[PDB]
Structures are given as structure tokens and as C-alpha cells.
Design brief:
Disulfide bonds: 43-96, 44-48
Number of strands: 13
Helix content: 10-25%
Distance between the termini: 18 Å
Strand content: 25-35%
Radius of gyration: 16 Å
Keywords: YTH domain, restriction endonuclease, DNA Binding Protein, DNA BINDING PROTEIN-DNA complex
Protein name: GTPase subunit of restriction endonuclease
Number of domains: 1
Shape: globular
PDB class: dna binding protein/dna
Organism: Thermococcus gammatolerans (strain DSM 15229 / JCM 11827 / EJ3)
DNA sequence: TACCGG
DNA sequence: ACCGGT
């Protein structure tokens, strides 16, 4: 029951990859024989929604099923700050399963990702991660972060989690 | 800055 | 340990 944040800067290849596999998604036939039939059955419909990283962990925390990912989307200004003057977005996904791809098998990841082979630690999301109506500053504030906190990949100290309990609850039914 | 370290 | 910097 952990919570992570992943910052997707607009106008960059991470945003492009975020378009393809989280916003648009990938038909499950184009994944058959690269991802297990069981992951495909239980985490995907005709479409899989998934993200990936180059390590298995985030601040030494590994990501497992049941956990949550807030994708912050906006124009990045400094390493971990966003421009609050242009549009921002927050999406919430719930991890279904995580799968590691072997380094002699990362070929297929380039089919839909720019430099995809570098990101062989995949995460699959039970349903398509949901676009919240909150801005990044509105979510940051609920978690006790600076308005423009925009981590590239952050772990949210559990004691902050209760500030967004309303939202996650409302999402389940 | 596909984030860690101190 | 998490943020919050350049």
C-alpha cells in the first residue's frame, strides 16, 4: 500500500512514451510472446496500460501490486519543479503487476517507446490510470509538498498519504 | 535531468 | 531517510 510520484515533463520523450502506453495504451496482441499470458489476462483488456523504469526501485522502495502511482504532467522548470504558469495534470493508477524484462529481450520495447530498451522494469495498471481534475499544486498541497514539487521519481512518506485519502476512496466505486 | 546521495 | 536543489 505504497504511493509513488512520477514526473512527466511536457515536450519530452518521456511524455511521448507516456502518451503511447498510459494515455493511448497498447493492444495486447502486440505484447503476446513478450509479456506473460497471465499478466495479459489479469491486468489487460484488449488494451494494456503500463509504464517502465530503468531500476526496480524508487528511493530504494520496490514497486508491487496494490501500490499507487501519481503521474504529474507539466512543463518542467528545474530538476524537481514544474512551471505553474502552463497547464498541469495529475493521473492516478493502481499497480496490477510488475514484470522485469531480461536485457537480451528488451528489443520489443522500442516498438512503442523512445529508448524503451532502457526501461525494462515495467509496471502494469489494472485499469487506465485516471485523469484527476486536480492540478499539481492542488495535489502537492494535500500531501504537504511545495506547490511546484515535481519529482522525476518520488516516494511519498506514508504520513503524507492521509491527505489524499478522500480522493483514492472516492475512486473505489 | 526517466534522482539519488548526503 | 525523504524532500528540494544547482
Amino acid at each position: 500500500n505504497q504511493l509513488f510520484i512520477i514526473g512527466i515533463g511536457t515536450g519530452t520523450d518521456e511524455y511521448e512514451n507516456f502518451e503511447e502506453t498510459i494515455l493511448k495504451g497498447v493492444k495486447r496482441n502486440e505484447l503476446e510472446g513478450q509479456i506473460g499470458p497471465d499478466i495479459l489476462d489479469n491486468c489487460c483488456s484488449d488494451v494494456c496500460y503500463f509504464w517502465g523504469r530503468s531500476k526496480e526501485t524508487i528511493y530504494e522502495k520496490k514497486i508491487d501490486k496494490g501500490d499507487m502511482v501519481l503521474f504529474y504532467v507539466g512543463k518542467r522548470i528545474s530538476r524537481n519543479k514544474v512551471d505553474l504558469n502552463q497547464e498541469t495534470a495529475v493521473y492516478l493508477g493502481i499497480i496490477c503487476e510488475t514484470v522485469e524484462i531480461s536485457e537480451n529481450d528488451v528489443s520489443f520495447l522500442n516498438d512503442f517507446w523512445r529508448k524503451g530498451e532502457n526501461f525494462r522494469f515495467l509496471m502494469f495498471f489494472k485499469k487506465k490510470p485516471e485523469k484527476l481534475h486536480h492540478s499539481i499544486n492542488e495535489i502537492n498541497s494535500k500531501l504537504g509538498y511545495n506547490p511546484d514539487y515535481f519529482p522525476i521519481a518520488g516516494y511519498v512518506k506514508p504520513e503524507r498519504m492521509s491527505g489524499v485519502y478522500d480522493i483514492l476512496k472516492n475512486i473505489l466505486k
